[PDB]
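User: Hey, my collaborator sent me this sequence without any context and asked if I could get a structure. I don't really work with proteins. Can you help?
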Amino acid sequence: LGSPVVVRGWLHKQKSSGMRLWKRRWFVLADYCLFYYKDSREEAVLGSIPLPSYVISPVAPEDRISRKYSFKAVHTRTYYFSADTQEDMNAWVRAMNQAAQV
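Assistant: No problem. I've predicted the 3D structure and written it out in structure-token form, which is a compact way to encode the shape of the chain:
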């Protein structure tokens, strides 16, 4: 992946389209970049989100998100994520913000 892994695990990512359905992907944060894969084998990169100029935080009421442990990355296009526990969400928010500072 070029760089040592800071953190990896499952997140649901919301689709940006009208229905705003969720899809579970396996994320890996390396250097300043978020990479995701179909599953935890990390075989083929499905996508990369470079994090510089994003700020990551828990969702607000006006985001209208009904999944628990949800957080968002907004530019200085917005991405909505949901973790499976409070702890994992807290760890992703800290890690994504660290990566977003170069």
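In plain terms: The chain is about 15% helix and 45% strand. You can pass these tokens on to your collaborator as they are.
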